[PDB]
């Protein structure tokens, strides 16, 4: 059966990547929340 | 400065071998000294063909506390305590109890 | 012009292997481990001026790191570049 995750690196990076996070104003808030928590990996790029 | 240094004559205050005298070989960073012929342990050395292929049991010296070893006066013939003074700009070490400079 | 500073920095090490030895004994090719930010012209100039031989062409490839386990702690051996340098039939390092 076709499941919900059909992966693609290009769509992954355009959706959740660092440059899209910096592009939207609330994405920068997301990065602030993750840095304040102390995540090893902020976005899906690494 | 350190009150007990390398190559001193020291006498053991407390331990297995109280009263024995010896010469300090080297001083470790963790506040422990190795005094020659004092704290003997029986190591079971594992023989290695790459290096040191003989085996056998080997009796070596283990570390003893710098608090446990005390400097040896050799004039009064007993243990002593070391203070610090300034003589001609140099910080020198001297036995208390007759105040003789080492 | 490429500076001697740059050349002495870019050449890193020789490479030893069965394939490298076969390349040396068959096609007059040496295999060199090279710093990653070095280009083909930089490797050619460095070999030509430091080993005092003459180079036909140079071929580069980036060797990827290896994921290793050290006591159930994952680690990653790093990348480097490898260079196959072809010599003109009469050098014989």
């Amino acid at each position: 059966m076709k499941r919900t995750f059909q992966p693609s690196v290009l769509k992954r990076n355009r959706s959740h990547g660092f440059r899209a996070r910096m592009a939207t104003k609330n994405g920068r808030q997301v990065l602030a929340r993750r840095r304040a928590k102390g995540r090893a990996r902020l976005t899906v790029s690494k | 400065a350190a009150k007990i240094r390398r190559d001193d004559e020291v006498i053991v205050l407390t331990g297995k071998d109280k009263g024995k005298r010896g010469k300090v070989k080297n001083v470790l960073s963790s506040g422990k000294v190795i005094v020659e012929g004092i704290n003997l342990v029986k190591k079971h050395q594992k023989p290695v063909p790459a290096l040191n292929q003989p085996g056998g049991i080997v009796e070596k010296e283990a570390a003893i506390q710098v608090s446990n070893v005390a400097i040896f006066n050799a004039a009064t013939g007993k243990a002593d305590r070391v203070g610090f003074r300034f003589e001609d700009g140099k910080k020198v070490r001297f036995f208390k109890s007759n105040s003789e400079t080492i | 012009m490429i500076r001697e500073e740059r050349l002495l920095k870019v050449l890193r090490a020789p490479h030893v292997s069965e394939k490298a030895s076969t390349a040396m004994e068959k096609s007059n090719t040496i295999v060199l481990k090279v710093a990653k930010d070095a280009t083909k012209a930089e490797i050619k100039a460095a070999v030509q001026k430091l080993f005092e031989v003459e180079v036909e062409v140079v071929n580069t490839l980036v060797v990827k790191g290896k994921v290793k386990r050290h006591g159930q702690r994952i680690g990653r051996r790093s990348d480097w570049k490898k260079a196959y340098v072809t010599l003109k039939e009469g050098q014989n390092l």
């Binding site: - | - | 001697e4 500073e5 002495l8 050449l11 890193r12 090490a13 020789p14 481990k33 430091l50």
Partner: protein, 62 residues
């Protein structure tokens, strides 16, 4: 090494740097080829190259 390196002029410093870099390259190739039991030479040459760069920057005055 610092004072006698400081008592040299700029051209002497540059050719000293080039000689040190040549020695660094030779030591690196030897150690990679499976020679050079003495690694303190590697450390010493690296730190001396750093010293020569420091004196070059001071003599340029930045």
């Amino acid at each position: 090494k610092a004072k006698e390196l400081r008592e040299k002029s700029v051209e002497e410093l540059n050719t000293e740097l080039l000689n040190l870099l040549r020695e660094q390259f030779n030591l690196r190739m030897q150690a990679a080829s499976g020679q050079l039991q003495q690694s303190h030479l590697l450390k010493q040459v690296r730190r001396d190259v750093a010293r020569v760069k420091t004196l070059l920057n001071e003599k340029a005055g930045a």
